[PDB]
Design a binder for this molecule. Structure first.
Ligand SMILES: Nc1ncnc2[nH]cnc12
Ligand SMILES: Nc1ncnc2[nH]cnc12
Lengths: 290, 289, 277
């Protein structure tokens, strides 16, 4: 007890997943404030796991007002070594269809006003200046776990660099992808959606950043599964994103999301992470510029 | 019945549109509006006028209380908001003296309060995710364009008309705006990049005003006033405040004409269904419910 | 005459540019500066030094009080600010050990106090919309470039020289920076997009320092340093070159008359006051 342990952050359409029988419910505080909700601990098989809804169980907290620092820190505090996160998103690409999933490997950040670092010279932060490399922002091993889990659960995986497009059979998990994270709470204009598309981005979401950055700052291995619920608004009027559209597609996909997450947890449990964890901690220390 | 709010930007902080009924100070749950409001009538149509920046222009674009301004107009019972925004052209065919009835934007503002809803005490309870694919009221945009036609001002529609048929000064029937935070103008580097993205104009005051109007269930449309070519051309043509004001002055008369004709045209129609649909859109965007 | 302020970024957290003469710990209407300002002379030219990040580099780019730093310099009587910035390259021709006298930027910062003027209780009353088409002081840029030449450092200008003249290490005579908020570095995706926009370098501290300098009626120019043990040593060498360039630059500034330019800097601030219409 207790390394390794998997934190799971649930977004839209995934506010109150019943992933396992609750063992403990933790009301915690962090040096950066309260988490979105109480943290629920238990087991998937023999693997310690902790579940946390990003927006509160009642989804009363908008993406821009989520205390990403407290959520990640609380997970760290409870002994998590990994975080798996879900993120509802819209597709900016023809090959990414509602019902698909994307194991993101890249992002472009257009958020603001969100506390995005544990470190600084304000009293509300830890002392120091952390300049973390983010060139490939996710934990690669954990990404591959998510993909291998999809395969273990007989869900199609599409890998651009190894398969031709005819092998892109829906619904499928895309083995790579880039996300633009917008601040919200409004969805994009068509003008924004076309610009994002022209930039080469795969999907658009509101919740990926700064969660992914803070996980790394926290010395944790993080990976996102993005649930494609819509085509944003670059296609026809009938295909223009709204809350109803996002929710309806998510409820159709939740079963697969649950399956991937539970299998991913087991697979993380079947491996040693001593060196990777050590390298996570080390990357943090080497990143100190103070 | 219909009641039209008019929000006035740079070069239009004393619109003097009609002859005043009275001046009125209001309070909102989101703070004080930019100034008192002038209430009156255009013909038989109730109209309310609010300068965005205060009558002395002491409030910069990034510090304008757009929530309070928009909520104040809702609270006076406005069904529509017509806005003006001074802007720079990033394109050859949009020249100073022209107007643009915007249909799209790209948002580069930050630090502004851009929603009425949240989980903080200074906001309404709820998580509201408005669709914004086509962010204006289309009926109201078309009324602004018709108003221009009716006041014998040239209308240019790049969808039905060739570039050689562009006669200035003209109202462009569509256009997209990048809204920057201010208060500084753009670098040449920034202007070239916005231009490369395919944006038509640059301004500082469209967003979040347009988004809040939709959140408030109001029909909103903007007329952009081209006062300069930003800074993508030669040095003599690089935007500064004096250039902005000098051109805005020359264009104001046309701006006034369109707005007043627009107010009349809105009042001549029934908006019962549109208003219901406006209200329903808000309700359907509540994810917390 | 003139007085040259120097804002030292990474590598210049605690410089020894001249014999310390005066020490000034000030308080501005916009808060405290990053650290004490150090007074002195380069030859006959009055000079002031201030480390952007503070002596311990405790202060992250996004929490630097740029307003206080610039205002403090203005208050001490500075007419010029020369600034250094450590940066990453986005283009093949810009390599570690190179330098760039910037002439352009694209701003991606947010959350920073970026203007002296506004309606908030602690801003200067007024609305200021400064032109920023060419946001540096051009005479001052050319002084930096000349300073590089006077210290025998290669100068490369892609607009007037063949690629063959790009001999490293070199001062690139023009260049554009994207200024990101930090403190994290860019993802590959972000860098790809910035590069595709045509940006030359990426940094975290240029904006709003350059904007504020202009609002203050000061002449500002920036010398960027393009940046394991061989990288550290290279950066140590870069700092030595920049130190030399700035010293020569202060001398070169003091040798010229700046009456009209200073006047015109001041007139640009007044003509940008929209509230004074
Ligand atoms: N199109 C979209 N943009 C942003 N966040 C989203 N979440 C789901 N769909 C989205
Ligand atoms: N070029 C410009 N940029 C931003 N706001 C403006 N308002 C008028 N011209 C402008």
């Amino acid at each position: 007890m207790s390394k390794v342990k998997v934190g799971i952050i649930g977004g839209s359409g995934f506010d109150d997943p019943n992933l396992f029988k609750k063992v403990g419910v933790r009301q915690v505080t962090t040096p950066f404030g309260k988490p979105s909700d109480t943290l629920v601990e238990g087991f998937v098989g023999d693997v310690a796991c902790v579940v946390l809804p990003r927006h509160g169980k009642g989804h009363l907290i908008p993406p821009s007002e989520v205390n990403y620092r407290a959520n990640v820190w609380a997970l760290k505090d409870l002994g998590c070594t990994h975080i798996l996160a879900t993120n509802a998103c819209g597709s900016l690409q023809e090959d990414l269809v509602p019902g698909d999933f994307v194991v993101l490997n890249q992002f472009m950040d257009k958020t603001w006003g969100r506390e995005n670092t544990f470190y600084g010279s304000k009293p509300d932060s830890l002392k120091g200046v952390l300049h973390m490399p983010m060139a490939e922002p996710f934990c690669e091993r954990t990404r591959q776990i998510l993909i291998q889990a999809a395969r273990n659960k007989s869900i199609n995986v599409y890998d651009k660099k190894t398969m031709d497009k005819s092998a892109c059979i829906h619904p499928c998990v895309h083995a790579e992808g880039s996300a633009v994270t917008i601040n919200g709470p409004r969805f994009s204009t068509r003008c924004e959606s076309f610009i994002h598309k022209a930039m080469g981005l795969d999907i658009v979401n509101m919740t990926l950043v700064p969660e992914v950055s803070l996980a790394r700052e926290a010395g944790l291995s993080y990976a996102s599964i993005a649930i494609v619920t819509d085509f944003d608004c670059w296609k026809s009027e009938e295909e223009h994103v709204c809350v109803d559209m996002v929710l309806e597609q998510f409820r159709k996909s939740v079963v697969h999301v649950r399956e991937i997450l539970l299998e991913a947890v087991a697979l993380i449990g079947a491996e040693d992470w001593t060196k990777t964890i050590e390298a996570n901690k080390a990357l943090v220390m080497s990143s100190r510029q103070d």
